């Protein structure tokens, strides 16, 4: 659904905590307005995983929806003595940041959100490793997503889950083995997933499955004024209670009572939504987030 991709799940907040000048169009992201922290993900040719799960949450959305927590320092200062907490973790990542960006966020190895930031008139370099002075007219108001990922809510416990990769000694900042032969190093696009009580879990394989449903989270409701989001909680179910009156597709009318003259809004079933599960070492689990990132991998020969 092309324009309904801006009808976000949850609150739809796509702002970073320290940059609130875009709140009019990022808090929340909806049909109207532009958002420097969100529109990046919908450019065709970029972020293929999120674009195939676009009705799920972004990293910023998962943070403001209490699904993902912030790092103990929520943002690292590149132009300091060290920029330490993110520096060692950012250098193993091969990233590309567009111009005029003051902040860039990523999923930590701890399953939390870290941010890389710069002074008010610096741009992030093309590798997101240094702060370069601004050669635009003005900076963007938001933060650039470094990884291609989507997120969801989950109570499935993954405290027993850990990275298992064939013949891999070091992937990113994770050392899996003691390798004393001399090794093969390369930048590999490695999938990963975060679980409730786990760290980041890299995988040889991305095996995902979706169970679609007719729960309220799988619907996009909207009204014409010119599109405006509508919350399905105001719609009465079949034999139910409603503060407003709605209509919709055959999927919505199968569970909610439909009225195709009076309607305040229209609800469509967001195809592609639902609960996503991933296979980790031969076991299906409900992850908090799933994504890719190009990072340094050392494999034994």
């Amino acid at each position: 659904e092309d324009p309904h991709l801006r009808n976000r799940p949850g609150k739809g907040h796509n702002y970073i905590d320290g940059m609130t000048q875009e709140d009019a169009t990022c808090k929340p992201v909806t049909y109207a307005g532009a958002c420097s922290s969100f529109d990046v993900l919908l450019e065709k040719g970029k972020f293929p995983l999120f674009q195939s799960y676009a009705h799920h949450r972004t990293l910023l959305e998962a943070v403001h929806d209490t699904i993902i927590a912030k790092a103990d320092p929520p943002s690292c200062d590149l132009q300091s003595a060290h920029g330490n907490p993110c520096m060692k973790e950012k250098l193993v990542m091969k990233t590309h940041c567009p111009n005029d960006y003051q902040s860039a966020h990523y999923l930590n190895n701890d399953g939390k959100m870290a941010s890389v930031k710069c002074p008010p008139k610096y741009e992030l370099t093309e590798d997101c490793n240094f702060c370069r002075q601004m050669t635009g007219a003005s900076l963007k108001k938001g933060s650039y997503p470094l990884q291609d990922l989507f997120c969801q809510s989950s109570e499935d416990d993954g405290s027993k889950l850990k990275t298992k990769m064939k013949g891999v000694c070091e992937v990113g900042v994770q050392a899996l083995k003691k390798c004393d032969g001399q090794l093969s190093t390369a930048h590999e696009v490695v999938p990963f997933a975060v679980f409730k009580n786990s760290k980041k879990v890299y995988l040889d394989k991305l095996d995902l499955k979706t169970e679609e449903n007719l729960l309220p989270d799988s619907f996009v409701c909207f009204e014409h004024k010119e599109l405006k989001s509508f919350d399905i909680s105001q719609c009465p179910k079949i034999g139910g209670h409603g503060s407003k009156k709605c209509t919709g597709d055959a999927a919505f009318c199968s569970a909610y009572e439909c009225t195709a003259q009076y309607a305040n809004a229209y609800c469509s079933h967001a195809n592609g939504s639902g609960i996503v599960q991933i296979q980790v070492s031969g076991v299906w689990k409900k992850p908090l987030c799933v994504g890719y990132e190009r990072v340094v991998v050392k494999r034994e020969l």
Epitope: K11, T20, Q21, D23, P28, P119, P120, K121, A137, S138
Partner: antibody
Framework: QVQLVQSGAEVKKPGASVKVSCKVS????????MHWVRQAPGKGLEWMGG????????IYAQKFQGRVTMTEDTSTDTAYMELSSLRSEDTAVYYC??????????????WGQGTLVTVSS | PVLTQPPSSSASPGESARLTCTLP?????????IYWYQQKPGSPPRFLLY?????????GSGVPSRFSGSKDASDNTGILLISGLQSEDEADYYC?????????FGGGTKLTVLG
């Protein structure tokens, strides 16, 4: 088009509380983030607090923290602002206000007409 | 953060008035949207326009294009420019920035169109 109407002028003894209203018409209150700004006579504007509806959290300024309380009546589209432990320096015109950037579609009111509150015994 | 505006400013009719809004040294004008309000006695403040950049800016409803905004990075100032000054423009003018959970207003500037 939004219409913001505040209650009438007030006189309160020092130490008591004052309660100001802002009635919203032409728009639904539960889609607006209402703020409050006061202005002592002949002086500048001062932000007192606001309610973030996207967050559902009420924020206050520290100069008033403990004294200013913000409620609402969704059935009447009316927001309320309560200031306690009134002192002589609290004499001001109290405005209910709306973010002009987020609500650039509105061609009606962004501020209330104002409510004068005099503190005297 | 304190926003300092000159207490008063004056210009002749037909000329251009330039009102400044200087920010402290620990924050930058380049980071924030800059609100500008016009307030006349007996009435609430009226939103003039906001300026962040030449591509991120907006004008208030019913506000003539004589009112425009800009920034000066070297002086760390937000600027409200009123071209073709007319008699009805004599009022108080406030600037506002929204960096965190607070509306921070400048001291206000009494602009007198020099009768």
């Amino acid at each position: 088009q939004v219409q913001l109407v505040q209650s009438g002028a007030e006189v309160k003894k020092p130490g008591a509380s004052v309660k100001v209203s802002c009635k919203v018409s032409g728009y639904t209150l539960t889609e607006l983030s209402m703020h409050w700004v006061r202005q002592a006579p002949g002086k500048g504007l001062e932000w007192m607090g606001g309610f973030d509806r996207e967050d559902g959290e009420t924020i206050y300024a520290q100069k008033f923290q403990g004294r200013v309380t913000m409620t609402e009546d969704t059935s009447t589209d009316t927001a309320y602002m309560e200031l306690s432990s009134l002192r002589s320096e609290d004499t001001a015109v109290y405005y209910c206000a709306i973010d002009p950037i987020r609500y650039n579609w509105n061609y009606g009111d962004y501020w209330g007409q104002g409510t004068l509150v005099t503190v005297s015994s | 953060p304190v926003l300092t505006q000159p207490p008063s400013s004056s210009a002749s009719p037909g000329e251009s008035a330039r009102l400044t809004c200087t920010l402290p040294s620990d924050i930058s004008v380049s980071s924030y949207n800059i609100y500008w309000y016009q307030q006349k006695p007996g009435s609430p403040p009226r939103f003039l326009l906001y300026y962040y950049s030449d591509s991120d800016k907006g004008q208030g409803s019913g506000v003539p294009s004589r009112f425009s905004g800009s920034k000066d990075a070297s002086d760390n100032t937000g600027i409200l420019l009123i071209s073709g000054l007319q008699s009805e423009d004599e009022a108080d003018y406030y600037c506002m920035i929204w960096p965190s959970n607070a509306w921070v207003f400048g001291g206000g500037t009494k602009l007198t169109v020099l009768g």
